[PDB]
From Swiss-Prot:
GO terms for molecular function: cysteine dioxygenase activity; ferrous iron binding; nickel cation binding; zinc ion binding. It comes from Rattus norvegicus. Catalyzes the oxidation of cysteine to cysteine sulfinic acid with addition of molecular dioxygen. Keywords: Dioxygenase, Iron, Metal-binding, Oxidoreductase, Thioether bond. The thioether cross-link between Cys-89 and Tyr-153 plays a structural role through stabilizing the Fe(2+) ion, and prevents the production of highly damaging free hydroxyl radicals by holding the oxygen radical via hydroxyl hydrogen. This is Cysteine dioxygenase type 1. The keyword Disulfide bond does not apply.
Amino acid sequence: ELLKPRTLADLIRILHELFAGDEVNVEEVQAVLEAYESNPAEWALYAKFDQYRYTRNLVDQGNGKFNLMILCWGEGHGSSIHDHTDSHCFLKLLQGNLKETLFDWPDKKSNEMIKKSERTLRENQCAYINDSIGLHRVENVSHTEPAVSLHLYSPPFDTCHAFDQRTGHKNKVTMTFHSKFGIRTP
Ligand SMILES: [Fe+3]
């Protein structure tokens, strides 16, 4: 029985129920994330921006089943083209808009990675990606509005690959947290 999360804390409690077992009902997780109506006062603690690039702010560790984090995207900040390390990845907009560009996995031959599609993710919409679907880039293309998104990854992962758009070549990158549970973590 999926109920509407009344608050961020209620959402977290519901997520612990949805991840109590060993598998993931993607459609139910996405539905509950979509149904949470972003309330800025509930997540202000985690919305810690950096001037130069987007930040990752850990909210909950899901009793080991998932990482739940808030990403804070300054104007013009964006990600690499990246994978998700054999994990489910849900992305819900809490504030602003983000452009998501999808790419196929590269072949062995060095070639330009050509986007397969793009879409604008708007406030409160929850999207989903996994390595079977493909790779993506996420960007705040706004000149005037910072964006904030809520991301859930299951299982949690500390590393992933960035792909060079000119060649498809990949490099391993380690995820760094700007803060954890509201506390800045150098
Ligand atoms: Fe991603």
